[PDB]
């Protein structure tokens, strides 16, 4: 009931809508018809307003064929359009009807019924006949109430045969507020306070009279429904949970939506707040008018889109923060007006007018809106029976004219043909309707089967610094590993703790002893070690201070120091340790060398050399005796196109993988040199005056050194990126790959915005297999953070799903995948909650889940 909305302010895995959910799209007469003075159409206030306050449009009135084509392409069930009143009744009074306009609406209605599309017909979408503004004052004069009911009566009589869904007025809030409050809309009276509320009053009363008209005289033999489309915005409190911010939030909502909803969908009166705040500006319903307003809508038509949001004078925000959260808005309607049936009568956003058909953001705005509606239906039980995307085609967007576009279909207004081209959102909304929700198509069904008996089941941690069971450090770790059925453990050493000099002339032997103790205790648990020599983090670069101050990784001698460190660790641990990662994610170490674009490429060259020197040392001097294996970890998030209808975004997704994985993988795995794609792309944007960076060619000696220096392929995979082609300026590494990212705010994500996109790991493994062949692959890091400190449902979810796709890559795709290391074992207090154990070493639920998988070698039938 009134006021119940304030409550609003004080793992979702659904993709598809209710059976029989109802998909549509909308237009409004004035935006799309054109032909404003054609075949005896009377002028509207909006015709006068444009030719006074401003300076063919989509020309639907002559191209009905072309819009019926677009409707068929989308596959919508309903189409919502509006009858231009002055095209029927030039003087609004119902003297002789203009038979050519009646022919147009009749022809449209016939075509929709024969294509099985339900019409939703809107009587009044702001284009009041000019003659009623001049003779009467338009909605200021209450004689309009019967002038409007007469017009509806004819419309029911001429079309009710074929129309079962009727809207009286589209968004009466803007009619009153911008027509007479702000002057932004026809007729353009600014600051007229008394008009605003008299106009609103006449619109309410006219609607009610049309509802009762329809209820009595047409519903029995036509059996349709009538509502009114109430627009509104949404608002959230300035301060977190400020009790009076919340009260102002409620005031904002009432002032826009309650003003018209409370008479029609509520108790039959204006909102009590308004009645106080406006005790004598605001008209009064008699107690009998109160009983004939209550209930004059057969459903809640609701509009939520850019016109209730911009310009800033459209609503009173009352100091609290603006919001696009449609789910909460729908919830507000549910509590205020007691869970009615909702049709979303208008929803969408807008794109800049120089975007033609590649409307990438429009897709993600549509995805986000649709997701909120599905949450509303499923989580909150809100009776949303239908969705009207907005709008079918580009047209004249009221005071903005043609400076924004809102159509699912592009119209070049400078061409006579005015063809309707499907934008990317038209492709997207098409598939949405086909599948009745989110494309359930990139998600293959679960496999039953098992990993081979010799698969590595790992857990990873990062750098451990030194302090056998003497060492308290190692006890607490063993207590954690004892609760895991993992067979491998992956941990990093601290280069600066072993050789504080960075030279072998000063070895911390206590530090090696602590590391050895870590390996040897783990062998007692029956757990093998994979030791990472160098694991740079944001917080600690990891270099011994002398080589940091001597230019770090830009200094080629830093690569030799690393070889000295590698040999030491191979010598003092290699009898115990059979798996080695030289460097963890050197490809993402470019960002520390942010400055020159040639700076990040040089540091990466010395990083490749460090690895190849360490690896050759092992291969020559330590493998014969120790018979272990050595590689490095690459960060390897998957990439898909942001806009999948843009051939340019497909190419950007491959370029991303080139710059991310092939940068290191191509020389060290396959050819001893940088990948062609990368050298050749950096060629153009420097041969085309955009970047002063060169990717230096590598000496045939340099080629020889790096080629073939990996015993297996190691990948740290967490998420999938959605990438856009965008030509960037500058010469930084980021700049040369010409890539921007789009966060799909609608996917199951972690606190830190890691997307759960399981099938990305399967695509990655096959991309790796196909570029670098049937060499062995270990996933050396895989995880996600999670707010939950005992029941990490998101980690459990991620782990089950991604491991299921790894199984698919093994059983179905035949990728030589040998191991999975989960990320990570424990978490530090300031740091994102990535651990299987809390900072206090308490175990989370996912441990039992990970063990169960390990015990089963997968997901057996």
């Amino acid at each position, epitope marked *: 009931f009134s006021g119940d909305g304030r409550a609003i302010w004080s793992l979702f895995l659904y993709d598809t809508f209710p059976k029989n959910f109802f998909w549509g799209i909308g237009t409004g007469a004035l935006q799309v018809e054109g032909s404003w003075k054609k075949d005896g159409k009377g002028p509207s206030i909006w015709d006068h307003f444009i030719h006074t306050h401003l300076k063919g449009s989509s020309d639907s009135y002559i191209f009905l064929e072309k819009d019926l084509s677009a409707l068929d392409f989308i596959g919508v069930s309903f189409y919502q359009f509006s009858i231009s009143w002055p095209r029927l009744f030039p003087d609004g009074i*119902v003297t002789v009807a203009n038979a050519k306009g009646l022919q147009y609406y009749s022809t449209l209605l016939d075509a929709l019924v024969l294509r099985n599309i339900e019409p939703i017909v809107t009587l009044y979408h702001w284009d009041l006949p000019l003659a009623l503004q001049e003779k009467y004052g338009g909605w200021k004069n209450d004689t309009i109430i019967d002038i409007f009911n007469d017009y509806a009566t004819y419309c029911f009589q001429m079309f009710g045969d074929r129309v079962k869904y009727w809207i009286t007025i589209h968004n009466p809030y803007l009619v009153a507020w911008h027509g007479y409050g702000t002057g932004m809309h026809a007729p353009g009276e600014k600051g007229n306070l008394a008009a605003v509320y008299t106009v609103g009053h006449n619109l309410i009363k006219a609607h009610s009279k049309v509802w009762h008209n329809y209820n009595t005289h047409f519903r029995p033999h036509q059996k349709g429904w009538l509502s009114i489309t109430l627009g509104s915005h949404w608002i959230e409190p300035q301060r977190s949970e400020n009790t009076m911010d919340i009260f102002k939030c409620q005031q904002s909502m009432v002032s826009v939506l309650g003003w018209f909803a409370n008479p029609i969908h509520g108790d039959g009166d204006y909102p009590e707040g308004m009645r106080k705040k406006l005790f004598s500006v605001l008209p009064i319903f008699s107690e009998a008018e109160k009983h004939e307003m209550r209930g004059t809508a057969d459903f809640f038509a609701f509009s939520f889109g850019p016109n209730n949001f911009k310009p800033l004078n459209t609503m009173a925000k009352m100091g609290q923060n603006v919001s696009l959260n449609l789910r909460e808005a729908l919830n507000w309607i549910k509590l205020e007006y007691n869970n009615p049936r909702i049709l979303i009568a208008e929803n969408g956003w807008f794109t800049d007018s120089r975007v033609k058909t590649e409307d990438t953001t429009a897709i993600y705005m549509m995805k986000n809106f649709l997701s909120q509606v599905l949450q509303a239906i499923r989580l909150d039980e809100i009776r949303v029976f239908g969705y009207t995307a907005w709008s079918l085609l580009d047209g004249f967007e009221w005071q903005d004219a043609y400076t924004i576009r809102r159509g699912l279909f592009y119209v070049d207004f400078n061409s006579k043909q005015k063809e309707r081209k499907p934008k990317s959102s038209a492709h997207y909304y098409k598939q949405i309707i086909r599948e009745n929700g989110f494309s359930l198509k990139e998600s293959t069904p679960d496999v039953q089967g098992q990993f081979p008996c010799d698969f590595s089941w790992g857990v990873t941690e990062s750098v451990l610094k030194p302090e056998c069971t003497d060492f308290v450090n190692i006890k607490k770790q063993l207590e954690m590993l004892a609760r895991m059925k993992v067979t491998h453990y992956r941990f990093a050493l601290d280069w600066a703790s072993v050789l504080p000099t960075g030279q072998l002339s000063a070895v911390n032997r206590q530090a090696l002893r602590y590391y050895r103790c870590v390996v040897s205790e783990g062998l007692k648990l029956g757990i093998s070690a994979m030791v990472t020599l160098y694991y740079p983090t944001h917080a600690h670069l990891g270099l011994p201070e002398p080589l940091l101050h001597a230019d770090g990784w830009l200094n080629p001698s830093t690569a030799e120091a690393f070889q000295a460190y590698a040999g030491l660790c191979f010598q003092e641990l290699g009898d115990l340790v059979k798996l080695w990662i030289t460097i963890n994610e050197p490809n993402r170490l470019s960002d520390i060398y942010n400055r020159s674009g040639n700076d990040t490429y040089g540091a990466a060259h010395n990083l490749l050399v460090a690895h190849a020197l360490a690896w050759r040392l092992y291969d020559r001097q330590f493998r014969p005796s120790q018979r272990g294996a050595v590689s490095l970890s690459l960060h390897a998030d998957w990439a898909e196109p942001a806009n999948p209808y843009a051939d340019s975004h497909w190419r950007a997704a491959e370029r991303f993988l080139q710059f991310e994985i092939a940068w290191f993988a191509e020389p060290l795995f396959k050819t001893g040199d940088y990948p062609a794609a990368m050298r050749e792309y950096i060629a153009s944007k420097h041969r085309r005056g955009l970047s002063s960076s060169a990717l230096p060619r590598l000496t045939e000696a340099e080629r020889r050194l790096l080629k073939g220096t990996v015993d297996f392929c190691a990948l740290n995979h967490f998420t999938t990126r959605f990438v856009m082609h965008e030509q960037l300026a500058g010469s930084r590494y980021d700049s040369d790959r010409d890539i921007q990212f789009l966060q799909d705010i609608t996917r199951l994500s972690s606190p830190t915005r890691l997307a759960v996109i399981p099938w990305g790991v399967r695509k990655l493994l096959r991309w790796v297999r196909r570029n670098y062949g049937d060499m062995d692959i270990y996933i050396t890091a895989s995880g996600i953070d999670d707010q939950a400190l005992e029941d990490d449902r998101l980690r459990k979810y991620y782990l089950g799903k991604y491991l299921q796709e790894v199984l698919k890559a093994y059983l179905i795709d035949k990728v030589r995948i040998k191991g999975y290391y989960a990320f990570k074992l424990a978490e530090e207090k300031s740091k994102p909650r990535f651990g299987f154990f809390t900072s206090d070493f308490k175990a989370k639920s996912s441990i039992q889940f990970y063990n169960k998988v390990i015990s089963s070698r997968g997901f057996p039938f």
Partner: nanobody
Amino acid sequence: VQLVESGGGLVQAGGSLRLSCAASFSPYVGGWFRQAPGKEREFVAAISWSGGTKLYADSVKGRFTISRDNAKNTVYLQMNTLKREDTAVYYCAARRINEVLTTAPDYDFWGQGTQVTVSS
């Protein structure tokens, strides 16, 4: 659809008279025509379903007013300052489509006719 006129009769010139047409479902346009012996029926006045639209013949604009009460299914013609030029048989008409038209082929149902006579 049956229509019935009421309130004809003889009136002194310059006097006043009020006809009503009672009907016996849907909305309709109420019409009024008058016919003199040997002349074609002439349109007098009509009224839309909720009275937003009223039309009159020029020869009666100012003197005649049409109105209706949908609740009683009755249209009224209030004739004031009657001339001898107003003597005729007066027929009420109904038209179903809520469009106010002035020619007689556009009305579907017709009343029996009531005589109005203006003498001095």
